[PDB]
């Protein structure tokens, strides 16, 4: 159905594109991380110009069709309710795990093993802290 | 006499039926199945099945002939027999008229996955034999077998009790000739862009 204007990537070009798509979106708020981070000029669809360094405000105003970047928006909704300070830090940290995952995919590591590898590594980091 | 509600296929439906008194001329066939597309062809198969019952009336509804490729091959030997019997230029069209009946057994072999080089010479030797006598005997019933199992070659169609009704076969020949007569009679047409 609707073969035209329809894109599909499975097992070949998807693993490489999902990492680069989230890397370009996360690279926007990397310079805004921290109190010394740099502001941005945001324009609402109604024409109002606002300036803030908060990652939540910047990500919430984003309306995008990128399927991987929507996962960053779905988590940001739960970040403000649970904590609210995990907006910019987690997205950069989550993208850091994706960049290291892409290096393991090129080495032949199974993606679920990478998922279970970060889960077991996160449990060890909690016991050390 | 009886109006009830019964469960057909998992759903409650109200059944309207009878037993003996108040004789009704209408009957209903209830079907069940998981596949929706298969039930569509079964209802159409019943419609074609009950329509053949209408052909059982006075105009020669009881007469039968062996089908599944049995009659089509035997008619070829009879048509070629009349080709040499009828002098004149008609010998070219009469011989080609019998060859046109070779497509029926061929398609039955192609749709069955059978080799075209196998069934055709087997049906020829089965329907053409030399009998030590005036009356031709033994098997005139050899058709195109469904195969997919068993052993070899062809066999009498009477074993499976399958035959073609004369009212269907005789009427189909008249329609097939008149349909080809119209096309062969038209040497020119005039159409427009649609």
């Amino acid at each position: 159905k609707d073969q035209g204007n329809k894109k599909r990537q499975h097992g070949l070009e998807a693993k490489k594109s999902h990492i680069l798509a989230a890397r370009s979106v996360a690279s926007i708020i990397k310079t805004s991380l921290g109190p010394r981070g740099l502001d941005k000029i945001l324009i609402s669809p109604d024409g109002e110009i606002t300036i803030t360094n908060d990652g939540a405000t910047i990500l919430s105003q984003m309306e995008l069709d990128n399927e991987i970047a929507k996962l960053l928006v779905q988590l940001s909704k739960s970040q403000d309710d649970e904590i609210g300070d995990g907006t910019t830090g987690v997205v950069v940290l989550a993208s850091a795990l994706l960049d290291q995952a892409l290096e393991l995919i090129q080495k032949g590591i199974h993606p679920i093993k990478i998922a279970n590898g970060f889960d077991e590594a996160a449990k060890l980091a909690i016991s050390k802290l | 006499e009886t109006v009830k509600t019964m469960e057909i296929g998992g759903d409650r439906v109200t059944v309207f039926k009878q037993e003996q008194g108040e004789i009704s001329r209408t009957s209903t066939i209830i079907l069940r199945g998981a596949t929706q597309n298969n039930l569509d062809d079964i209802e159409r198969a019943i419609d074609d099945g009950v329509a053949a019952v209408k052909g059982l009336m006075k105009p020669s509804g009881g007469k039968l002939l062996p089908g599944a490729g049995a009659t089509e091959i035997e008619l070829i030997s009879r048509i070629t027999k009349y080709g040499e019997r009828t002098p004149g230029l008609l010998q070219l069209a009469i011989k080609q008229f019998a060859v046109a009946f070779e497509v029926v057994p061929r398609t039955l072999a192609e749709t069955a996955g059978l080799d075209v080089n196998e069934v055709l010479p087997n049906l020829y030797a089965a329907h053409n034999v030399t009998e030590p006598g005036a009356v031709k005997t033994d098997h005139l019933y050899k058709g195109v077998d469904i195969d997919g199992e068993s052993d070899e070659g062809v066999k009498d169609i009477r074993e499976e009790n399958i035959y073609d009704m004369l009212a269907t076969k005789k009427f189909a020949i008249n329609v097939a000739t008149e349909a080809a007569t119209t096309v062969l009679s038209i040497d020119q047409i005039i159409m427009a862009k649609k």
Partner: protein
């Protein structure tokens, strides 16, 4: 003065079956990662703008609604697999799709599609016969309604 197909030609013959095989592989390769409890999930973005993520292959195929007839047949058996049973919705399409892949080289060698269908029908009758033998249901085996469970 009425055009049903609007003048759209379509190929016919044994080459059309191969085109239907590639349609079954495209549906299979999408459902290959979704097989199993640890299997991958498919992200589908509908034209309605609602984006959903589901592991169950039924809902995945219900949102796509492929118009292709050979691919829709795999969707129809998937909805009945989730309804009458509820388990094996993804595996029934992969098994049917992979069975289409094994019949692809048979058409290239000249084997008719009829004997291919009858060849698998005889194998299923022998396969189901072995399933009943491999199945374990015990009464007189010195088990009970409890000790077995």
């Amino acid at each position: 003065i009425v055009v049903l197909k609007e003048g759209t030609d379509a190929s016919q013959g044994k080459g059309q079956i191969i085109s239907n095989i590639n349609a079954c592989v495209a549906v299979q390769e999408a459902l290959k990662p979704t097989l199993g409890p640890l299997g991958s999930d498919i992200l589908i973005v509908t034209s309605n703008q609602k984006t959903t993520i589901s592991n169950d292959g039924a809902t995945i195929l219900k949102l796509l609604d492929v118009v292709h007839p050979a691919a829709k047949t795999l969707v129809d058996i998937s909805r009945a697999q989730d309804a009458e049973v509820g388990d094996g919705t993804t595996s029934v399409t992969i098994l049917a799709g992979e069975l289409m892949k094994e019949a692809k080289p048979f058409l290239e060698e000249g084997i008719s599609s009829h004997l291919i269908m009858k060849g698998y029908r005889k194998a299923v009758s022998l396969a189901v016969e072995k399933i009943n033998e491999l199945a374990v249901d015990i009464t007189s085996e010195k088990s009970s309604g409890r000790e077995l469970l």
